Design an enzyme around this catalytic site. Structure first.
Site, mmCIF file in Angstrom:
data_model
loop_
_atom_site.group_PDB
_atom_site.id
_atom_site.type_symbol
_atom_site.label_atom_id
_atom_site.label_comp_id
_atom_site.label_asym_id
_atom_site.label_seq_id
_atom_site.Cartn_x
_atom_site.Cartn_y
_atom_site.Cartn_z
ATOM 1 N N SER A 114 0.843 -1.182 0.000
ATOM 2 C CA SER A 114 0.000 0.000 0.000
ATOM 3 C C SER A 114 0.888 1.246 0.000
ATOM 4 O O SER A 114 1.819 1.350 -0.819
ATOM 5 C CB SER A 114 -0.964 -0.145 1.180
ATOM 6 O OG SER A 114 -2.056 0.756 1.067
ATOM 7 N N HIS A 174 -7.578 -5.717 -0.112
ATOM 8 C CA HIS A 174 -6.317 -5.017 0.023
ATOM 9 C C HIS A 174 -5.576 -5.581 1.227
ATOM 10 O O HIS A 174 -6.014 -5.407 2.366
ATOM 11 C CB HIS A 174 -6.585 -3.511 0.166
ATOM 12 C CG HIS A 174 -5.374 -2.643 0.001
ATOM 13 N ND1 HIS A 174 -4.759 -2.442 -1.216
ATOM 14 C CD2 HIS A 174 -4.682 -1.903 0.895
ATOM 15 C CE1 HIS A 174 -3.743 -1.614 -1.065
ATOM 16 N NE2 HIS A 174 -3.672 -1.273 0.206
#
Length: 392
Positions: free
Chosen positions: A232, A373
């Site tokens: 990320s 994610h």
């Protein structure tokens, strides 16, 4: 995707003047320095030079850790000699049976070093909370991030894992700068970063290179076989770290989004705006002029990623990547790959996005996986195949 805009990417193998980049020599000597400088000024910011001497202490070295699987070290790295300065605790796990110095994967960690594995002998780290307060972690949080680091797989592959908690470099909220390393480098009387000075993504990358500074002094570590991984927002940091630091033999950017691996021209500058609004510390001041395309970016993600060439680059995505843009991350990688061919290396090898759980490419690789994610076991299974290809 029928509602995604059309665009023409800035040409990675043309100089700003328009002249074509005809070979590796010309990339190395002309185009790459030009691209690096663009990103230094317009996106990440200028960082300080490498410190001549690394001030660090090996606080702890324990054999047989992790049920005998690992030698564990904990190394404190001081960003200033002043007490209560910002400092960094590096957690290293090396295979217990290591016969020679081991390859090491270095990672930036969203949690403290006690979250990386289920390791009772690791001190509970202080962490920054939902309320922008710093306080000691509860014991229940030990091992909370273990599935994201898969340390047993790494050691099983014959490699070491080094991790740092990123918020010891700079805490990740608007206002946390005062608590990090950036203030340490102000000039006499300076109190604020100039618009082309580093922001937080770059400080995190800078701290990863100081971790590399230690690993090259460690005699159980193969200094010529270290890579870097970031998930990320820390995948953004890892892209710039690798750009800045040729000692990383490869980087892995897991779902790194805008200002990372994702092509920005697949929207109208709204992600750039939301990032610069919500996280004004991440990029430098110059970057905010690209909000909502107020200025057109003389760059896009394929160029930042090509700063790795000829070294390894792994870009990866998740089907539901948040609202992130897996196709944009594939396209960043795919459009960077021609640079590798200048060096006789193979890149992604395609311009069409693969299906789930179908990794593509050689020195530049990509996969997209089902799920949310995160970093998962499946990701790591590919990362370690990649690491072997890079390192044999």
């Amino acid at each position: 995707e029928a509602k995604v805009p059309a665009y023409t990417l800035p040409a990675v193998l043309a100089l700003k003047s328009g002249q074509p980049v005809t070979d590796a020599k010309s990339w190395t000597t002309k185009r790459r320095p030009e691209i690096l400088a663009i990103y230094e000024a317009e996106v990440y910011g200028k960082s300080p030079a490498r410190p001549p001497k690394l001030n660090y202490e090996v606080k702890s070295v324990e054999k047989q850790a992790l049920g005998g699987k690992a030698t564990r070290k904990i190394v404190t790295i001081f960003f200033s000699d002043k007490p209560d300065a910002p400092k960094m605790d590096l957690l290293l796990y090396l295979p217990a049976a290591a016969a020679k110095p081991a390859p090491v994967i270095l990672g930036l960690s969203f949690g403290g070093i006690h979250t990386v594995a289920n390791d009772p002998g690791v001190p509970l780290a202080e962490q920054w909370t939902r309320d922008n307060r710093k306080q000691p972690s509860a014991e229940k949080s030990r091992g909370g991030e273990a599935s994201r680091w898969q340390v047993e797989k790494i050691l099983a592959a014959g490699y070491g894992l080094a991790t740092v908690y990123y918020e010891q470099i700079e805490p990740d909220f608007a206002g946390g700068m005062k608590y990090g390393i950036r203030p340490l480098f102000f000039k006499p009387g300076q109190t604020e970063p100039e618009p082309g000075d580093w922001g937080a993504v770059a400080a995190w990358a800078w701290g990863a290179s100081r971790a590399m500074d230690y690993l090259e002094k460690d005699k159980d570590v193969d200094a010529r076989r270290v890579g870097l991984i970031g998930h990320s927002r820390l995948g953004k940091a890892a892209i710039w770290a690798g750009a800045q630091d040729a000692r990383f033999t490869f980087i892995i950017s897991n779902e790194s989004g805008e200002g990372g691996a994702a092509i920005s021209r697949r929207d109208y500058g709204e992600r750039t705006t939301a990032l610069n609004t919500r996280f004004p510390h991440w990029f430098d001041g110059n970057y905010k002029k690209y909000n909502d395309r107020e200025n057109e970016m003389p760059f896009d993600s394929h160029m930042a990623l090509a700063l790795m060439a000829p070294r390894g680059l792994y870009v990866a995505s998740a089907e539901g990547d948040q609202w992130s843009d897996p196709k944009g991350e594939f396209l960043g990688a795919a459009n960077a790959s021609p640079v590798w061919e200048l060096f006789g290396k193979k890149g992604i090898g395609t311009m069409t996005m693969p299906d789930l759980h179908e990794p593509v490419g050689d020195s530049v690789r990509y996969h997209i996986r089902a799920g949310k994610h995160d970093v998962t076991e499946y990701d790591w299974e590919q990362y370690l195949k990649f690491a072997k290809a890079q390192w044999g």
